[PDB]
Amino acid sequence: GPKEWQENKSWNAHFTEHKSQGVVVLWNENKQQGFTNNLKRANQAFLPASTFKIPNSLIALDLGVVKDEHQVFKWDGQTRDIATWNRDHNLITAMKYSVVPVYQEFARQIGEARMSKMLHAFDYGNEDISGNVDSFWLDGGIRISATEQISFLRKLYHNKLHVSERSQRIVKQAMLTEANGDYIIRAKTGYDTKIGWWVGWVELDDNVWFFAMNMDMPTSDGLGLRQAITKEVLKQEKIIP
Amino acid sequence: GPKEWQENKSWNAHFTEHKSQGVVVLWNENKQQGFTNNLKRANQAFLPASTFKIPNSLIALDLGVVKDEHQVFKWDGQTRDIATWNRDHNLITAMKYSVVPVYQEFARQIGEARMSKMLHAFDYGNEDISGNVDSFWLDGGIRISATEQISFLRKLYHNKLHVSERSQRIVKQAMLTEANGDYIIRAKTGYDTKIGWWVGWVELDDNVWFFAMNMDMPTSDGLGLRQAITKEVLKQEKIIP
Numbered sequence: 001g002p003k004e005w006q007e008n009k010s011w012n013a014h015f016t017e018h019k020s021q022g023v024v025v026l027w028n029e030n031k032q033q034g035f036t037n038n039l040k041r042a043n044q045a046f047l048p049a050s051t052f053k054i055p056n057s058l059i060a061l062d063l064g065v066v067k068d069e070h071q072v073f074k075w076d077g078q079t080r081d082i083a084t085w086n087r088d089h090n091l092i093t094a095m096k097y098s099v100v101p102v103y104q105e106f107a108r109q110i111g112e113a114r115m116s117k118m119l120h121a122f123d124y125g126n127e128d129i130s131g132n133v134d135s136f137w138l139d140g141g142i143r144i145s146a147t148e149q150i151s152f153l154r155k156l157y158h159n160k161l162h163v164s165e166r167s168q169r170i171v172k173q174a175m176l177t178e179a180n181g182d183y184i185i186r187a188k189t190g191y192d193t194k195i196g197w198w199v200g201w202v203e204l205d206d207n208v209w210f211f212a213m214n215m216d217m218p219t220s221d222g223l224g225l226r227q228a229i230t231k232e233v234l235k236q237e238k239i240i241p
Numbered sequence: 242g243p244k245e246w247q248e249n250k251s252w253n254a255h256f257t258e259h260k261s262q263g264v265v266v267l268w269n270e271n272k273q274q275g276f277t278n279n280l281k282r283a284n285q286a287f288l289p290a291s292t293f294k295i296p297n298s299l300i301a302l303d304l305g306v307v308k309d310e311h312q313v314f315k316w317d318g319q320t321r322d323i324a325t326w327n328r329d330h331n332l333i334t335a336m337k338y339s340v341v342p343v344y345q346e347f348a349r350q351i352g353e354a355r356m357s358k359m360l361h362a363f364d365y366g367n368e369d370i371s372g373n374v375d376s377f378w379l380d381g382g383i384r385i386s387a388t389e390q391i392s393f394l395r396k397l398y399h400n401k402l403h404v405s406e407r408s409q410r411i412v413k414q415a416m417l418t419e420a421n422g423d424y425i426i427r428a429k430t431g432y433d434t435k436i437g438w439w440v441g442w443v444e445l446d447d448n449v450w451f452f453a454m455n456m457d458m459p460t461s462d463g464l465g466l467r468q469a470i471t472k473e474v475l476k477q478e479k480i481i482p
């Protein structure tokens with residue numbers, strides 16, 4: 001019989017070209033088949049860092065902490081290192097610019113009991129929120145693997161998560177990253193100071209490819225490699241031109 | 242004091258450069274002010290042609306004629322001149338490739354009584370569905386102006402049309418045309434053998450610009466000028482780079 005999961009080590013060339021190491025995991029939805037350059041690392045669990053703003057957004061919307069994607073979260077007046085954070089935001093721009101202080105406020109309003117119950121209902125990673133209610137995805141006990149990211153994203157794509165369909169549609173809107181006549185990418189980046197993430201999917205006319213990548217990332221200087229390397233794999237597999 | 246609509250005839254150079262004539266209408270949502278090169282033509286009502294796929298989609302979804310944006314509508318097997326039409330489609334690709342036969346079947350299932358009632362509820366153009374229920378937007382009595390297109394699109398953007406929020410969110414997803422780190426365009430083209438249309442909006446971080454353009458289109462050779470001329474105006478107004 002055919003294999004659900006296949007290893008393709010030729011993708012390592014795209015990491016080695018940049019003196020880095022990592023994993024790309026792809027899932028072909030039509031074929032129900034997955035592909036990766038590193039089967040073991042594909043299933044190892046890491047801190048989600050800013051990719052947690054996908055479930056955080058879903059929970060905040062479903063609970064009414066965030067009313068809709070137009071509600072304004074005012075800047076608290078503290079000047080931070082990332083210039084795009086020093087302004088008012090809504091859900092769309094807070095995800096686009098990965099605005100930490102806005103999502104810390106969401107997490108505090110959600111609170112520990114409801115955050116834990118929702119991640120259990122999502123089957124999200126190891127479901128463990130130990131640590132600070134407003135930072136556990138960066139320095140606490142939650143862990144998720146690349147294959148677990150894909151499983152979560154597939155439920156989101158199909159509106160199968162336990163939260164309202166409305167919440168799922170709003171977050172999928174907020175994940176929009178790039179679109180043209182050839183493809184649509186909905187995705188979210190993350191960085192925990194050691195590992196960089198990019199997770200999401202590529203919508204084509206007749207198929208959707210889910211992806212989850214992480215890579216060793218010692219400094220923020222190489223952050224654009226997250227998208228660049230993933231796109232090299234997508235080009236090799238003839239998913240995008 | 243300032244006027245709701247300002248005329249900017251310098252945009253005519255973008256039509257003149259292509260030996261063409263037409264109108265571009267812009268609406269700045271934050272400032273609640275509009276701009277056009279031709280106020281008279283901005284209020285001239287034309288057949289909507291394929292821009293009618295926006296209200297048609299909304300009605301089909303709200304009535305359950307279309308269950309969701311993934312439902313597949315099989316090719317009926319008749320070979321038509323536009324090759325992308327000769328295949329199975331869902332709502333996303335039917336709007337992307339402007340697949341008339343799919344939308345003709347939606348319209349027949351909606352039926353004239355519900356179609357007329359919903360266009361009245363939408364305040365859509367002259368609300369006149371005289372002709373065949375499956376072709377009145379191509380060769381019947383319905384007429385809509387560029388400013389009326391803006392009015393309709395503003396209601397859709399704000400979820401204020403008399404259909405479910407869900408239907409409006411799905412259609413706005415289906416209108417997605419282009420997205421990058423600078424802007425998002427949601428829009429729909431149309432062509433009636435005499436006039437070409439492009440209507441929609443540009444989402445920025447902190448504003449939305451609605452647009453509706455139409456131009457004289459004697460042959461199909463110049464159809465790419467609908468987007469190209471509109472983008473020259475957007476570039477001149479520093480809405481997009």
Ligand SMILES: *C(=O)N1C[C@H](NOS(=O)(=O)O)CC[C@H]1C(N)=O
Nearest residue numbers: 049050051098100189190191192
């Ligand atoms: C999330 O991982 N973080 C917030 C912000 N996002 O940048 S990313 O999306 O481009 O990686 C900066 C990195 C990180 C953090 N420092 O908390």
Ligand SMILES: *C(=O)N1C[C@H](NOS(=O)(=O)O)CC[C@H]1C(N)=O
Nearest residue numbers: 290291292339341430431432433
């Ligand atoms: C809609 O106006 N039509 C369907 C199709 N779409 O072309 S467009 O979207 O690029 O203008 C072809 C033109 C037109 C029609 N023939 O009815």
Ligand SMILES: [Cl-]
Nearest residue numbers: 173176414417
């Ligand atoms: Cl979208």
